[PDB]
Design a protein around this ligand. Structure first.
Ligand SMILES: C[S@@+](CC[C@H](N)C(=O)[O-])C[C@H]1O[C@@H](n2cnc3c(N)ncnc32)[C@H](O)[C@@H]1O
Ligand SMILES: C[S@@+](CC[C@H](N)C(=O)[O-])C[C@H]1O[C@@H](n2cnc3c(N)ncnc32)[C@H](O)[C@@H]1O
Ligand SMILES: [Co+2]
Ligand SMILES: [Co+2]
Ligand SMILES: [Co+2]
Ligand SMILES: [Co+2]
Lengths: 262, 261
């Protein structure tokens, strides 16, 4: 591992960091960007492999990074804001290895809640859910089907650090359903056509998987079908539906009402 | 000729719509933009004054427009691109008169819930809160002190039409405190300081006001100094805060738990 320095833009490897805003480029190295000193330090504790650092506690983190076998860049405010695309950047920005938990490795125990998101489209919605699931003491996020990337800069920002603190996993519809049966869980699907008050449900007996639907479309039958309980939050207006993240928060804290205290 | 067409983007009739991006123009013209036909209809059905209407049921809408003294505009999909600042946007756009409820015209009755936001800065947060508060069946939003603007296009998008549906007042800390002290309400302020568990509060006796804090600071002591109760939602982790809108949604559904089904 090694240190380096640059101020010009083109210098191919600085177009390499820039391009971590694109999925196709992030995926070509299983890699992603996160901003902030406090944050990179915390993500290092949670055991995340750092590939590059960008920038006095920096000395020890750079040491930890170069000694871990990867690049480190002393750099001006013009470069840092251009890669983070903000006029008013942070001084320190880490690049890290993406990691998902494989779904087969996840074994729901008593007392645990999971959030499964069928085809989540909006990045902020996802990042906010990840943050909120973390806050509720849930044990992970399961991204079912084609969703937005959890490791986009837009989504990573919205987590406020929680991307590093709660397991994320991804699966096609079939494997998830296979898993969801074998796991011995109370599957709680949510629909705007659901029959039962989310408050009237048993979240105590079994580990729970909260199944949330797509923003435009809601849950497709193939997953709706599986519900051990088809729940809905009562509303009272013109309003069609709740925002996805909002709904997920409402459910997180009902589902763990008995477990959260002061 | 209220039924009127334009192709040119040079036309000053267009660059004055684009000026609605600016808050100056928005505020000094008392107007704002809203996208989509089912909005533009339901806002018409909700009694809103449409100034301008750009673009099957469209004819029935351009009628209600002109009947109420509103100008109409036929323009190409690329004119609608440049006003909106959007890829692929809706066929219709509507420009309306802004509508704030004066605070002292609000009379908190029994079984009603109001949300008050101190210094909300994020357009999305607000937009969503407005949405969530419509859905929880709350009687109105109260914006306290310097906030992002609820009639901005960003915030309007995030309400998904709920901006037309729930009244919005605005006030500085003084006016708010004045009205509050008179209006006879249970002010439940979300804090972490003097705070009790949010599921233990009495939300039945007095019409409730939920007073949520600023995304960075949180509530300023002078506001929390006049709170009937201080509520906190318990959490688990290094994660110190809930997103404001998330916190507000949770509070809303606890505050109206006894009322919703
Ligand atoms: C924006 S919504 C979906 C809207 C839905 N397709 C419709 O228009 O009929 C996104 C998701 O949030 C959740 N959601 C929203 N409102 C809800 C409610 N009252 N009860 C349960 N879930 C809700 C559901 O999981 C839903 O699939
Ligand atoms: C993101 S917070 C900022 C709080 C601030 N960081 C602090 O140190 O208090 C925005 C506001 O949302 C509300 N909020 C967020 N999490 C909350 C919780 N767990 N309980 C009650 N209110 C909360 C509060 O009104 C808070 O002032
Ligand atoms: Co590349
Ligand atoms: Co639907
Ligand atoms: Co002007
Ligand atoms: Co704080």
């Amino acid at each position: 591992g090694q240190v380096k320095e640059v101020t010009s833009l083109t210098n191919p490897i600085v177009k390499d960091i820039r391009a971590l805003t694109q999925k196709k480029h992030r995926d070509e190295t299983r890699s992603f960007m996160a901003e902030g000193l406090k944050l990179v330090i915390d993500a290092l504790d949670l055991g995340w492999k750092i590939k590059t650092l960008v920038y006095p506690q920096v000395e020890q983190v750079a040491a930890k990074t170069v000694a871990r076998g990867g690049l480190v860049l002393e750099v001006n405010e013009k470069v840092i804001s251009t890669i983070t695309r903000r006029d008013n950047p942070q001084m320190v920005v880490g690049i890290f290895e993406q990691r998902y938990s494989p779904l087969r490795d996840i074994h729901p125990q008593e007392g645990e809640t999971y959030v499964a998101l069928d085809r989540v489209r909006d990045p902020g919605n996802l990042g906010t859910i990840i943050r909120t699931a973390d806050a509720a003491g849930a044990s992970g996020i399961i991204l079912v089907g084609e969703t937005t990337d959890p490791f986009s800069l837009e989504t990573v920002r919205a987590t406020m650090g929680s991307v590093f603190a709660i397991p994320i996993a991804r699966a096609n519809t079939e494997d998830f359903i296979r898993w969801q049966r074998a796991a011995g869980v109370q599957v709680v699907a949510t629909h705007l056509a659901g029959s039962v008050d989310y408050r009237t449900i048993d979240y105590k007996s079994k580990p729970v998987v909260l199944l949330m639907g797509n923003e435009q479309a809601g849950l497709p039958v193939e997953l709706a079908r599986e519900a051990g309980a088809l729940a809905r939050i009562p509303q009272a207006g013109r309003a069609d539906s709740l925002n996805l993240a909002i709904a997920t928060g409402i459910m997180l804290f009902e589902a763990r009402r008995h477990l959260l205290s002061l």
